[PDB]
Design a protein around this motif. Sequence first.
Motif, short mmCIF file in Angstrom:
data_model
loop_
_atom_site.label_atom_id
_atom_site.label_comp_id
_atom_site.label_asym_id
_atom_site.label_seq_id
_atom_site.Cartn_x
_atom_site.Cartn_y
_atom_site.Cartn_z
N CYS A 84 0.76 -1.24 0.04
CA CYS A 84 0.00 -0.18 0.07
C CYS A 84 0.72 1.18 -0.20
CB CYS A 84 -0.82 0.23 1.42
SG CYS A 84 -1.41 1.65 1.58
N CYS A 133 -0.73 2.32 4.25
CA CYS A 133 -0.65 1.05 5.28
C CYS A 133 0.69 0.11 4.98
CB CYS A 133 -1.85 0.21 5.00
SG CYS A 133 -3.65 0.80 4.85
N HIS A 137 -7.48 -2.42 -3.00
CA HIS A 137 -7.20 -1.40 -1.85
C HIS A 137 -7.27 0.05 -2.49
CE1 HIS A 137 -6.17 -0.14 2.08
NE2 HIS A 137 -4.88 0.66 1.55
N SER A 159 -11.41 0.67 -3.49
CA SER A 159 -12.25 1.38 -2.58
C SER A 159 -11.68 2.72 -1.86
CB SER A 159 -12.21 0.17 -1.21
OG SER A 159 -12.95 -0.89 -1.76
N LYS A 160 -12.50 3.48 -1.33
CA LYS A 160 -11.88 4.55 -0.77
C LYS A 160 -11.16 4.78 0.52
CE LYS A 160 -16.24 3.55 0.92
NZ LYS A 160 -16.07 3.41 2.20
N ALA A 161 -10.03 3.65 0.18
CA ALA A 161 -9.16 3.49 1.34
C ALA A 161 -8.38 4.92 1.63
CB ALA A 161 -7.91 2.66 0.84
N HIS A 162 -7.32 5.48 1.07
CA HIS A 162 -6.76 6.54 1.34
C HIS A 162 -5.38 6.69 0.30
CE1 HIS A 162 -4.21 4.14 4.29
NE2 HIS A 162 -4.29 3.50 3.14
#
Length: 30
Positions: A5, A8, A21, A24-27
């Motif tokens: 990531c 993360c 990852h 999706s609206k992870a970051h």
Amino acid sequence: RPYHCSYCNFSFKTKGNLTKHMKSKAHSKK
Ligand SMILES: [Zn+2]
């Protein structure tokens, strides 16, 4: 493992996953 990531430490095994990852609206707008 060329799949870590951009934040993360959630490592994967392929792109389809790492992307899941970043998908999706992870970051990761950067
Ligand atoms: Zn992350």
